[PDB]
Amino acid sequence: VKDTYTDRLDDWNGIIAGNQYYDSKNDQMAKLNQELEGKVADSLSSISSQADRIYLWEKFSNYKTSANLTATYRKLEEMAKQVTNPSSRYYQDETVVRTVRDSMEWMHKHVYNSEKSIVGNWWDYEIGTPRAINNTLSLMKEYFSDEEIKKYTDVIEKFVPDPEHFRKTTDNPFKALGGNLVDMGRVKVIAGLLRKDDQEISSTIRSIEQVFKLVDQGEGFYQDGSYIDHTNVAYTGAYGNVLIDGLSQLLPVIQKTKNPIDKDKMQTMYHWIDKSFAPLLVNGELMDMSRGRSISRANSEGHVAAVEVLRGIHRIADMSEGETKQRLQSLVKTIVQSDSYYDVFKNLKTYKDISLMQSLLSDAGVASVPRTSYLSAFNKMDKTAMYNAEKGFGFGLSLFSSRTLNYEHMNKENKRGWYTSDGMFYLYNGDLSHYSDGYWPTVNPYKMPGTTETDAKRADSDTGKVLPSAFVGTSKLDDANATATMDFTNWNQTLTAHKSWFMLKDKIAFLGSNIQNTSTDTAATTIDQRKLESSNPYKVYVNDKEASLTEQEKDYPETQSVFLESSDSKKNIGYFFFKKSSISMSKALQKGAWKDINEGQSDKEVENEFLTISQAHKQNGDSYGYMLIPNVDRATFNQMIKELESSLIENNETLQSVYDAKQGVWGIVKYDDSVSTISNQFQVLKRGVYTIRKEGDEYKIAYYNPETQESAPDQEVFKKL
Ligand SMILES: O=C1O[C@H]([C@H](O)CO)C(O)=C1O
């Protein structure tokens, strides 16, 4: 009742709503206010106003489905925001004030109280709903009595009494870490501020600290930047988001309590941003390979997901000072400005976040220079991110091994992500909307780019698996060159292939050998499946001769090269086959719906055109070998393949190697411990992945053993000839 807790709750309110920063003459703020007003109007004109109703809102009447619980409270929160906004048409409106208060009671008496038990997802009973309830009582604290707040938060205590574990009410609770651990703070630090429970605050804060540590196993952030969740899933771009997004919201309040958090523990926060998040952001897009099952959500495509991270970073920068505040500010500014496809404000949902972004972008003192080149090998989550600032393209390598799950199909989401980690690659170029605009529900799940597979049908009911082999990993020499491999075996053990990738600054070689098939199904590797633009059509050249592609698969034997020519060179893609190969191509309209891959999504039909290139393997001991060259014009491409006409050093069952003469760099993958002499210059001696650079008479070496996850002394793996 107007004490020190209300002081902290006031700060929270300024963070989650920020009504005190509202300015009607502010274009962006007025827009968001227009959105909230419309939400509250729709909730008010559709709410049940009859005697003894059986649902507050019919669209969320089935209180057997966990979602209907927090979606219902989310509506009362939106009302709490407008009722306290002086510029809203619902400011201090008696019907809104009474509706909220009245609605808290009904839900409490008949749907969510202490004498209840989890039904559906636990997430809604412990995180979603409790969060929406906390925010509502905080925003409207001047309309509720302390006793009413106590009474209304008691149920949160029942379901979430332990700030260390979740599902404590059920039979199989679990330890809270990472994203979920941060959501625990949003539930118990606020509920504790509302209930004026000092014990609850200190113990949840004390428990939040756990997040500030790095891990060498299990869930959490690794020192190499990888972030794992759900036991063994690469998840920086989804659960990592929740972590930073939520922690950046809480910190300001936490720090003003009697239990602040050590300035050094937050030193690691800057590490996550620089080592984990930043590399996954390309032209404002958050690489899908790190978003797990969220890739199947229509309203959370790459550019939109990226904004959850950016606003968290922004909030953190604002907490810092001096250089740190400056550098984080420029990181956010340059990324936001490099995004010509998505409007960042479309995902800044509070007035403080909008105000912050505006200050940032209009401040000439904050630098905004193009990000420089970089290559991150997240070996702890079997992902690899590469970015070339000079030519301007990004590249992502999605793998998995015995240490990680290939794909997460859970809660009925991402039903067909079967091959998204079977050596699938991502190419981020001039077309910033490639993986957006319905790419996921329209891409053929059976031909993910870069993957070798049989045409056997797959079931939506299937779920993730780990790889039998641990020989999966990337050897990084510098920020422009690296080598990767995957001792691949498919889902039903009927196909194998030694797949290797050679990232050489401005191109990537794809080598595959030892391809074997014991099934009757047909086997082939998808060189590419690119989503086309009706605006920037491609002129296709095979062997440098114009070709006309059809929906029908056209076969091109003796193919030495394929070139996709756009009017914008930053969208061109070339494929040089080290040895004339038999490939087939087709261009076709592919239709689908989001519901097809996520039960909770829309059934509305979506469609996009895709250009598919693939190579069939009709024999045991088959292989493939091609160089991918993006962002160069036709004439340069033709020039480059002339130089690379001898870049293939080897590609068989025990050794794969490509040589970049212009750079003096070698990419090498050895599957056995025999001695391999390379280019009559040196010898490599151990199973593993190498990336070597000759500098004068000296050699720079980068060796990595994927199985043991260790490097090694040079003399054990390399011998100069
Ligand atoms: O962690 C989760 O995120 C979603 C959610 O629907 C977003 O509110 C959900 O389904 C989970 O179990």
From Swiss-Prot:
Disulphides: none
Which keywords accompany this UniProt record? Cell wall, Lyase, Peptidoglycan-anchor, Secreted, Signal
Q: Which GO terms describe its cellular component?
A: extracellular region
Q: Its principal location?
A: secreted
Cell location: Secreted, Cell wall
Q: Which domain of life is it from?
A: Bacteria
Family, similarity comment: Belongs to the polysaccharide lyase 8 family.
Q: What is the name attached to this protein's record?
A: Hyaluronate lyase
Q: What is the protein's species of origin? A: Streptococcus pneumoniae serotype 4 (strain ATCC BAA-334 / TIGR4)
Q: Which residues of the full protein are shown?
A: 287 to 1007 of 1066
